[PDB]
Design a protein around this ligand. Structure first.
Ligand code: ZN
Ligand code: ZN
Ligand code: ZN
Ligand code: ZN
Lengths: 95, 148, 99
């Protein structure tokens, strides 16, 4: 049941599936790329555990988790295509 | 037996995903002693050749590299008459995430693109640098003479 | 590879994106494998610099020694601080392969 994996493959910030999963390396907590990048625009704390990143530019401590993305795409078939479609709808409406 | 376990996994991986133009496996049921075969790469002057190698795994594999040498004589600036191979990843640059599959592929790339500024056979490196035609000619000749 | 300011720059799509609202384990072989022992990850430890994953025992044995580099991508591992346990990856593994 795809539902059973939700806790390990969803974003603590937006509660949806992890999209371009991005890891805060100091505490190894992972979020959508957009979610964590935008959070860091006015905070230095991990949104999950509150651990403060020590660099002036918190983006220095981010890494894309490509392995996790591939696992998520295999656990949630169709997700890869749904997000590409979602993006396509945006550009078609704005372009 | 962690080394033996690792070697066995590699064997299974090779059966599932063999490296292009290469094969390898135990000689007569000694898991720590393998033979490999490399078909001469198409791009290279070794084209058509069949090249045999011997592989000896150490007891603490994969944390120490395997010993890999050619048993087929070959005209190449980085491989000598003992069949010893000058290849970074076999010595100074080994890593425990490497496997025989990856080593064979690197050797193929070495056959395609020699490193004359890190040789084992000076005269061959000299010839490769200063006269490619002659290097190709003799490479091909040695391939017909030894790599049946 | 790319400058930091490029890597994390969000597209116009990404600046307005909304959540994506919430089969056989065999196909996950590569993703769950330890690059050192070639078996499924146990007691996962993950490099801070490159997010490469190894069994605790595997990477510890490798580092000592060693060259003090990530076995997968060769990046320097400045210290003991350079690795950290990944319990969430272990739990995901456990849900994929229950005991
Ligand atoms: Zn999110
Ligand atoms: Zn955290
Ligand atoms: Zn391992
Ligand atoms: Zn790495």
């Amino acid at each position: 049941l795809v539902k059973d994996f939700n806790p390990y493959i969803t974003c603590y910030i937006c509660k949806g599936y992890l999209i371009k999963p991005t890891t805060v390396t100091e505490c190894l907590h992972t979020f959508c790329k957009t979610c964590i990048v935008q959070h860091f625009e006015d905070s230095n704390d991990c949104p999950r555990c509150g651990n403060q990143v020590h660099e002036t530019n918190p983006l220095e401590m981010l890494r894309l988790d490509n392995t996790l993305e591939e696992i998520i795409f295999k656990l949630v078939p169709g997700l890869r295509e749904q997000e590409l479609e979602r993006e396509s709808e945006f550009w078609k409406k704005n372009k | 037996g962690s080394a033996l376990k690792r070697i066995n996994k590699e064997l299974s991986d090779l059966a599932r995903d063999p490296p292009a133009q290469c094969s390898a496996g135990p000689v007569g049921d000694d898991m720590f002693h393998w033979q490999a075969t490399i078909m001469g790469p198409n791009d290279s002057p070794y084209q058509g050749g069949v090249f045999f190698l011997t592989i000896h795994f150490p007891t603490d594999y994969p944390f120490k590299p395997p010993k890999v040498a050619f048993t087929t004589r070959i005209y190449h600036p980085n491989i000598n008459s003992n069949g010893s191979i000058c290849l970074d990843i076999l010595r100074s640059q080994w890593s425990p995430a490497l496997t025989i599959s990856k080593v064979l592929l690197s050797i193929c790339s070495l056959l395609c693109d020699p490193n004359p500024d890190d040789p084992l056979v000076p005269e061959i490196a000299r010839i490769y640098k200063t006269d490619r035609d002659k290097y190709n000619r003799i490479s091909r000749e040695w391939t017909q003479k030894y790599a049946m | 590879t790319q400058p930091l300011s490029k890597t994390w720059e969000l597209s116009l799509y990404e600046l307005q994106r909304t959540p994506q609202e919430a089969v056989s384990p065999r196909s996950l072989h590569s993703e769950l494998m330890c690059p050192i022992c070639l078996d499924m990850l146990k007691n996962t430890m993950t490099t801070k610099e490159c997010l490469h994953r190894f069994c605790a025992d595997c990477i510890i044995t490798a580092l000592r020694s060693g060259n003090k580099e990530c076995p997968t991508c060769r990046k320097k591992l400045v210290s003991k601080r350079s690795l950290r346990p990944d319990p969430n990856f272990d739990a995901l593994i456990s849900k994929i392969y229950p005991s």
